Amino acid sequence: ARVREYSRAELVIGTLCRVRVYSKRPAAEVHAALEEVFTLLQQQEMVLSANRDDSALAALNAQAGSAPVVVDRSLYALLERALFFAEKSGGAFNPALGAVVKLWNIGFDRAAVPDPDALKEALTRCDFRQVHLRAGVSVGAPHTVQLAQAGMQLDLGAIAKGFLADKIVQLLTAHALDSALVDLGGNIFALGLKYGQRLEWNVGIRDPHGTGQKPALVVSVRDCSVVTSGAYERFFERDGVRYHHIIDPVTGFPAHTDVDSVSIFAPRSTDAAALATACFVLGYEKSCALLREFPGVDALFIFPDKRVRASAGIVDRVRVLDARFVLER
Ligand SMILES: Nc1ncnc2c1ncn2[C@@H]1O[C@H](CO)[C@@H](O)[C@H]1O
Ligand SMILES: [Mg+2]
């Protein structure tokens, strides 16, 4: 039986999604797995999207201020995990920020900053503590979500790709695959080892102010997600000012922070995504404080002066490719 390398890529969930596999299984088995990966990505686009009218999430948001809504266990568990990171991060990551994000999403489309009072009003409808998850304990009992605050809206944009990367890894494993690189719009999961000999996957992290083509550094990892938050992934400009996609929930404006990017290395991409978002909002010192709560996670920060700091679990695995950057040790 020979090793073969495969990849497949499609535009889906608003972005380029690519999966690379090494396997000695029959090629028909790998093809079947990849078929299911990309079918899943189409199906979940219709469950999780905050910017479509027909999604399960859109339906949930339509019942804000009303009765509990039944959801499948997958969505329920994702919402539980999101609320866990909201609480741990003091709301720096907030999955109920839709009232504010939607004002900014139209701003992006129109290259215009939302209004002062409107934004102030929207912030009154973002209390994630008013998202009530309840699930009975008896056989077959439903899972429910209630949005208690009138006009509050869930937005899982910061974590949807991480969730889908974890679902993809679980699907690959279900198909007896153990070597893959999952890349959903830049949210990475490195499953197992690649082949050259078996070697770690070398995950690239971009120059925050670069074109994105080439990585500024790489980190060698196994069985790890790598998710990076940076202003650069999505912004608009108006009258000399850049407004990026990661909102500070205290201000209702794009976060003003002391790092250019934060990359989180975690066993679960869902977790890495939530934590990367929180850490970008919190800034470096408070991020270090939060991350001490999660010993199984590593982090790499790129500062505006091109210094790079990485935690102990990964620092020896970092290789700088763009010599303008310096890895502090
Ligand atoms: N502080 C935040 N916490 C959670 N999600 C956010 C936050 N700011 C923006 N978002 C959402 O996550 C996306 C950025 O990853 C945004 O497009 C928006 O949907
Ligand atoms: Mg700040």
Swiss-Prot record:
InterPro entries (UniProt xref): ApbE, ApbE-like_sf
Catalytic reaction annotation: L-threonyl-[protein] + FAD = FMN-L-threonyl-[protein] + AMP + H(+)
Database matches in PROSITE patterns: PROKAR_LIPOPROTEIN
Main enzyme class: transferase
Record key words, sorted: Cell inner membrane, Cell membrane, FAD, Flavoprotein, Lipoprotein, Magnesium, Membrane, Metal-binding, Palmitate, Signal, Transferase
Topology of the protein relative to the lipid bilayer: Lipid-anchor
An annotated Gene Ontology molecular function: transferase activity
Cofactor entry: Mg(2+); Mn(2+)
Cofactor mode of binding and number, as noted: Magnesium. Can also use manganese.
Annotated Mg(2+) binding sites: 158, 273, 277
Subunit: Monomer.
Record's protein name: FAD:protein FMN transferase
Subcellular location: Cell inner membrane
UniProt-listed Enzyme Commission number(s): 2.7.1.180
Any Pfam family the entry gives: ApbE
GO cellular component, one term: plasma membrane
Residues the record lists as binding FAD: 92-94, 155, 161, 245-247
